[PDB]
């Protein structure tokens, strides 16, 4: 994650990928297990996206708002905000 670009987006996708697998474990309820491990992995990346927002907002408030709303185009033409609402990532 540290490497490349689109850091804030990659962190809010990851939070969504882990959070859904953390649900399908508790849903599928088969031989599989290890969901609260996934729950933690989502909240790990989730805080990373929040701490990048903080940083980016303390520099220029106006540009940070634009970061929450530009189309991504590597991520199904979605938005970092829209992704964070999917994960119910409240902070």
**b/e burial code for range 57-85 (CB count within 10 A of at least 16 → b):** eeeeeeebeebeeeebeebeebbbeebbe
Binder among 8, 9, 10, 16 for a second copy (CB under 8 A): 16
Surface-to-core class of residue 34, CB atoms within 10 Å of its CB (0-12 exposed, 13-18 middle, 19+ buried): exposed
Please list every residue from 30 through 69 that binds a second copy, using CB under 8 A.
30-32
Judged by CB, which is closer to a second copy: 28, or 69? 28
Contact criterion met (CB below 8 Å) for 48 and 13: no
Q: Which helix (H) or strand (E) covers residue 3, if one does?
A: none
- Check binding of 6 to a second copy (CB under 8 A): no
Q: How near is the Cβ of 68 to a second copy at its closest, in Å?
A: 18
Q: How near is the Cβ of 7 to a second copy at its closest, in Å?
A: 11
CA 77 centroid distance within chain: 15
Please list every residue from 70 through 89 that binds a second copy, using CB under 8 A.
74, 76, 78, 86
Q: Which residues bind a second copy (CB under 8 A)?
A: 2-3, 13, 16-17, 20-21, 24-25, 28, 30-32, 74, 76, 78, 86
């Amino acid at each position: 994650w540290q490497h490349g670009e689109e850091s804030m987006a990659k962190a809010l996708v990851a939070c969504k990928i882990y959070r859904s697998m953390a649900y399908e474990a508790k849903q599928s309820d088969l031989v599989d297990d290890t969901s609260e491990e996934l729950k933690q992995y989502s909240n790990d990346f989730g805080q990373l996206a929040v701490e990048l927002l903080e940083q980016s907002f303390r520099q220029d408030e106006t540009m940070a708002m634009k970061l929450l709303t530009y189309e991504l185009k590597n991520w199904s033409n979605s938005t970092c905000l829209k992704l964070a609402v999917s994960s119910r990532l409240r902070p």
